[PDB]
Nucleic acid binder design. Structure first.
Length: 767
RNA sequence: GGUAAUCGCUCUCCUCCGGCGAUUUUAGUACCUGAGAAAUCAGAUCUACUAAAACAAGGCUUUAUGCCGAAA
DNA sequence: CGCCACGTCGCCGGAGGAGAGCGATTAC
DNA sequence: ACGTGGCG
């Protein structure tokens, strides 16, 4: 679902960012080990340094800065994007992208790939060929100008520069075993690591007859033999069926033919006129559907120029080579696969097959359903006995069943969409529960229906009529969405630290937001944009003259044409398109400013909207006080199995909620009779006694700062939180203070519907 | 009805390799305001432009085409 | 202290498997 | 969906 697509985008982005950091670090190491020192003062006018280096000598500092910049924007190697590519192509016939960006700076003062200007589409997404040409020019100029660079440095820098792993290798290396790439963590009997040649190979589907074998590639010898036998076997001519001798002769002729016209060939082999035709699959659109050997004829006409005999090839060698040509698409993988195959190939054949793959890719459309085992079992009996393929399939009746495992006794069905997997898991859980209690009377739909029918027909004396649970559960996992990204920068006003969000003017919704903020007087009181007093009333002047019911700036550039700039006698003011404004205080935050060089917990840069994990109801028998000590996702140091809250970052919430003082700790609880009464997770069940009616409600989380604040959900349905008025469902919250109440209770509820009352739990420092 | 195989045309899922961004902190310049004839200085450090770093909090040993980390 | 309105990340490009659906069919 | 200040 959208969530796994998100997980993927983040994983790929993280891998690319980490590969970029490694690139920069390796460049720094090469700079150190080559006899040069990293400078301390960095230059900002990088592009002008590129222009200088094209012709004139550059210092070590300038060269270091330009190389560091180059390693970050090394371009792409092989709508607005394609049109921008066309413009870079038409401008690259004379010059390199550095000069184009120079001109963009000179006449527009910007570089990035967003240049709506009819409209022109200047951009920054260039091609690696131009960057490499620029690097070659720069390096040659510096070398000819008596620089300190030696050829080893340029060669090694370009080796670092062109770091690009291949899509069929993935992450991990020969010492960093991960199950996401080629170098895996599984160990053999000797303890050595396991190494593959291509990742997609294991993903190939199984055969439809023998479920322990890999399918065949539809471009080989045996595949085309089988398909041409099926096609010519079905045809009926002159109310006579083709005989075995006729089948052999027609196969020999069609293999030996260059262009196929089976009306003519068939009348030649039969030696009899033709009055009627059946089995011919002429398209109503005007195409004569035939299964003649296609890859055969092209391979014959191609390899016969260099005079290489395909008939000299064995069947297994041809099938194997046709499989590798099907899967492996690049030169290196193909060469390694042909090396692994002990058969010896001339380099001419390798190049010949590679160009054949690259020019007629459409032939290798996919994999034939069967495997080579069933195909080799079928073809000889297909040739000897002139019978239809479907009947020959059921002769050995190899499609018996797969009920052996089911009569021996989820994973046997789960293995056969990451959402319906969970759905069917819940279905089978409930079915087992009801079976143990009492009672036994699409692609996914077909699979699940067949599995249920098979399982219920495996039972003895069963007469079940199978004629044709939305992931409620609970949450118990760690390492979920920790925070909501969006790094925030915060400032200070009269001793209070306020988080600052910028407002985009050029968005209609935000244009209306600024409209209602300015008109209500709630903007001028804030000190944002008050640092320029003259630059503020210009907003009002532009606004009230052109208020309307649209974006005032849109009409401003439509009528006047000029944009909005900063007050200046010389009209030198940079354009204003985004205006910051205060948001409010921060109470819940993640202290990050220590990752910017600032002091610990300086709160200069924060991240907001943390997520909850658990809250532990606490009860003392001395007076029955309430301590709904909550826990959030940040306080957990987990990875898969070690859901450890740790000793610290748990007593601090304990103390803030009032359980403990500065001295008392997690061991000073028995003294006041303090221990768990429950352990509530998201989408749990809790009891309440508001006003002495018992309200059984779903616990969600803790919010705000007020002590004993619980958010509740209607037991019945979370999708009906509180419908207050006639026909509106406001998402009203159940912010409630549990400072003065007297009861709380959990009802562990399995799917069958039973309710279990819970008592003093063990502890929560799992692993 | 159901099953297998083919051909052509239209949608979805998983995995991998990259690019352009966006948001922040620090620094420079412009824009503002004082001193100054101006330059330049100090201070504001709001609105942009340019560099570097951060980019789920955090963890590894494999010190590198390094690795994990937002879904059963 | 209790209410209730605000506000939260996008776009491209190359692959390769694996699922379906709709038309023609050949049949069990 | 659901945190998380401000303003009576």
């Amino acid at each position: 679902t959208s969530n796994n697509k998100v997980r993927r985008t983040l994983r790929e982005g993280r891998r690319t960012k980490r590969r970029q950091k490694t690139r920069i670090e390796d460049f720094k190491q090469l700079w150190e080990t080559s006899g040069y020192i990293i400078p301390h003062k960095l230059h900002l006018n990088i592009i002008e340094l590129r222009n200088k280096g094209l012709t004139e000598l550059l210092s070590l500092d300038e060269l270091y800065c330009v190389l560091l910049s180059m390693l970050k924007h090394r371009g792409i190697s092989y709508n607005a994007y394609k049109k921008g590519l066309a413009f870079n192509e038409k401008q690259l016939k004379e010059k390199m992208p550095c000069e184009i960006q120079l001109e963009r700076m000179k006449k527009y003062g910007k570089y990035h790939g967003e240049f709506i200007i009819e409209k022109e589409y200047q951009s920054n997404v260039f091609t690696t060929k131009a960057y490499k040409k620029e690097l070659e020019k720069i390096f040659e100029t510096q070398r000819c100008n008596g620089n300190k660079i030696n050829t080893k440095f340029i060669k090694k820098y370009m080796e670092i520069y062109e770091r690009k792993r291949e899509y069929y290798i993935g992450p991990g290396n020969e010492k960093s075993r991960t199950d996401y790439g080629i170098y895996t963590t599984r160990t053999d009997e000797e303890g050595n690591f396991i190494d593959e040649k291509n990742i997609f190979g294991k993903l190939i589907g199984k055969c439809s007859v023998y479920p322990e074998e890999y399918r065949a590639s539809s471009a080989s010898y045996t595949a085309q033999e089988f398909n041409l036998l099926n096609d010519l076997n079905n045809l009926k001519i002159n109310n006579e069926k083709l005989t075995e001798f006729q089948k052999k002769e027609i196969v020999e002729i069609i293999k030996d033919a260059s262009s196929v016209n089976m009306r003519k060939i068939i009348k030649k082999v039969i030696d009899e006129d033709i009055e009627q035709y059946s089995g011919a699959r002429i398209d109503k659109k005007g195409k004569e559907i035939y299964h003649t050997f296609e890859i055969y004829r092209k391979l014959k006409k191609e390899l016969k120029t260099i005079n290489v005999d395909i008939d000299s090839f064995t069947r297994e060698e041809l099938d194997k080579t046709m499989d590798i040509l099907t899967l492996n698409t690049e030169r290196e993988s193909i060469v390694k696969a042909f090396d692994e195959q002990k058969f010896v190939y001339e380099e001419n054949l390798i190049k010949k097959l590679i160009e054949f793959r690259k020019n007629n890719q459409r032939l290798f459309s996919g994999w034939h359903s069967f495997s080579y085992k069933a195909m080799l079992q079928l073809i000889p009996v297909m040739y000897k006995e002139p019978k239809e393929q479907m009947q020959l399939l059921t002769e050995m009746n190899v499609f018996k069943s797969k009920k052996e495992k089911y009569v021996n006794y989820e994973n046997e069905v789960v293995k056969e969409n990451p959402v319906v997997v969970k759905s069917i898991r819940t279905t089978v859980k409930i079915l087992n529960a009801l079976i143990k209690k009492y009672g036994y009377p699409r692609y996914a739909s077909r699979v699940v229906l067949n599995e249920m029918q098979s399982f219920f027909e495996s039972r003895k004396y069963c007469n079940t009529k199978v004629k044709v649970k939305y992931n409620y559960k609970i949450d118990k996992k760690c390492n979920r969405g920790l925070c909501n990204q969006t790094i925030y920068g915060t400032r200070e006003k009269d001793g209070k630290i306020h988080k600052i969000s910028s407002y985009n003017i050029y968005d209609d919704k935000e244009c209306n937001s600024l409209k209602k903020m300015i008109n209500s007087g709630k903007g001028s009181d804030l000190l944002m944009y008050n640092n320029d007093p003259k630059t503020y009333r210009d907003m009002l002047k532009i606004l009230e003259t052109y208020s309307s019911e649209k974006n005032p700036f849109v009409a401003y550039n439509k009528e006047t044409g000029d944009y909005f700039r900063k007050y200046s006698k010389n009209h030198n003011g940079p354009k204003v398109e985004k205006v910051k404004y205060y948001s409010g205080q921060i109470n819940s935050c993640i202290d990050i400013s220590h990752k910017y060089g600032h002091a610990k917990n300086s709160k200069k840069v924060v991240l907001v909207s943390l997520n909850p994990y658990r809250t532990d109801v606490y009860y003392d028998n001395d007076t029955g006080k309430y301590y709904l000590v909550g826990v959030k996702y940040n306080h957990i140091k987990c990875v898969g199995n070690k859901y450890v809250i740790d000793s610290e970052t748990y007593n601090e919430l304990l103390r803030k909620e009032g359980v403990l003082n500065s001295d008392e700790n997690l061991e000073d609880l028995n003294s006041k009779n303090i221990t768990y009464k429950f352990s509530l997770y998201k989408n749990d069940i809790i009891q309440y006694e508001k006003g002495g009616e018992y309200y059984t409600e779903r616990f969600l989380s803790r919010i705000k700062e007020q002590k004993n604040l619980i958010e509740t959900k209607p037991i019945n349905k979370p999708n009906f939180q509180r419908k207050n008025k006639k026909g509106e469902w406001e998402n009203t919250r159940n912010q409630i203070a549990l400072a003065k109440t007297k009861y709380v209770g959990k009802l562990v509820t399995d799917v069958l519907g039973n309710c279990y009352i819970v008592n003093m739990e063990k502890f929560s420092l799992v692993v």
